[PDB]
Design a protein around this nucleic acid. Structure first.
Ligand code: CA
Lengths: 219, 219
DNA sequence: AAAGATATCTT
DNA sequence: AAAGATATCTT
């Protein structure tokens, strides 16, 4: 199935998971930083081709936001079913150590979940699912080697800013918590658990309605 | 000087190279997106190498933040001058047309500028200069087709999410405005004018004290 | 155009 | 706890 194939395609990365930098059409290459702001974008860009591929294989049309600051990242809907649109958002968090308690921010709770068309590509009601692709990596110190350019003949010499990269696909309500993920940016917080817990689905809400009904009243 | 040497190296690097994607150690490339979220990250990572070199060239030690939410992007100082540090932060904004007015967010005004050690690598009083490197691009088609991955043998093929990228270096206070660039995130807003005005530094503040004084009593 | 989104982290 | 930083945009 779509969902079963996507989660599997993500596991296989593309070629392989070892993104080392941004390349120029001139053939020059630049390293990557360690901060999440950097890997966040990278992961999101890393997922674009994989998604569009699986979606294509399952007769799905993908639509990214036209205007920035709009949710979600990917909208999968079929020509004949302009009623059941799928949403996929890429979330990423870091970890200082290995296999420890992590937590993601799952988007504000004062936007589309409260105003059917606030900050969202398509009207909320037109979506039946909300899949969250979460990425978890272990931070790494940006070595001095990361501050120099490389040529194509050295891709395997470009030091990586991360380590144990783990990915997962899961429904938003299934992995959401009861605590906010941010203050001034009123974000929904997920559960504070281990990577496995997200893959499994050990959450707190026993249904979508419960989730929506909890965060639409969060104060 | 270090400053003119920097801006010149930045002009060069921008004209002699065009970033087009993220490459893997396996030789796999993934196109970029046409949103400020992705580009600001690609521009930041694009500047690091140049900055580090020109720094070492003029006898300067470079230091990046240890925390994802610490300013500035780059800290330079001479070993025999630890209390005369220089702060370089990269900002990015987009345009829809050609010579079109723009405005940047120049960092918050309720942190390190009001609390000497709040959200900043080194104490505020230690920095004797705060430089801003501004990158301006123009949104494009954003693939709308190029959602696939490429290989090293197709660089010239990979489409670009930007059109007219221009960069400039200028003191934060010199291009600073009197209007907030952010609401909840209480960021300082620059002047709203053309690229040229930023280079020529046609700000509204006469000196840096006028700048600080204004944004420290801002509400 | 003040206020509040989009993502995520730190105190 | 929460409250509010990091950067940029939309309304
Ligand atoms: Ca997102």
């Amino acid at each position: 199935s779509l969902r079963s194939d996507l989660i599997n395609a993500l596991y296989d990365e593309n070629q392989k998971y070892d993104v080392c930098g941004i390349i120029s059409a001139e053939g020059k290459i630049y390293p990557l930083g360690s901060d999440t702001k950097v890997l966040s974008t990278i992961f999101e860009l890393f997922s674009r081709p994989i998604i569009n591929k699986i979606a294509e294989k399952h007769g799905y049309i993908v639509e990214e936001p036209k205007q920035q600051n709009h949710y979600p990242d990917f909208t999968l809907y079929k020509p004949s079913e302009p009623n059941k649109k799928i949403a996929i958002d890429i979330k990423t968090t870091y970890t200082n150590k290995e296999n420890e308690k992590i937590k993601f921010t799952l988007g504000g709770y004062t936007s589309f979940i409260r105003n059917n068309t606030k900050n969202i590509v398509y009207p909320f009601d037109q979506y039946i699912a909300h899949w969250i692709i979460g990425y978890v990596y272990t931070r790494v110190a940006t070595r001095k080697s990361s501050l120099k350019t490389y040529n194509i003949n050295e891709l395997n010499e470009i030091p990586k800013p991360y380590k144990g990269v783990k990915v997962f696909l899961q429904d938003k309500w299934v992995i959401a918590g009861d605590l906010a993920g941010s203050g001034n940016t009123t974000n929904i917080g997920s559960i504070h658990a281990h990577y496995k817990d997200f893959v499994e689905g050990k959450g707190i809400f026993d249904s979508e309605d419960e989730f929506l009904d909890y965060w639409r009243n969060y104060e």
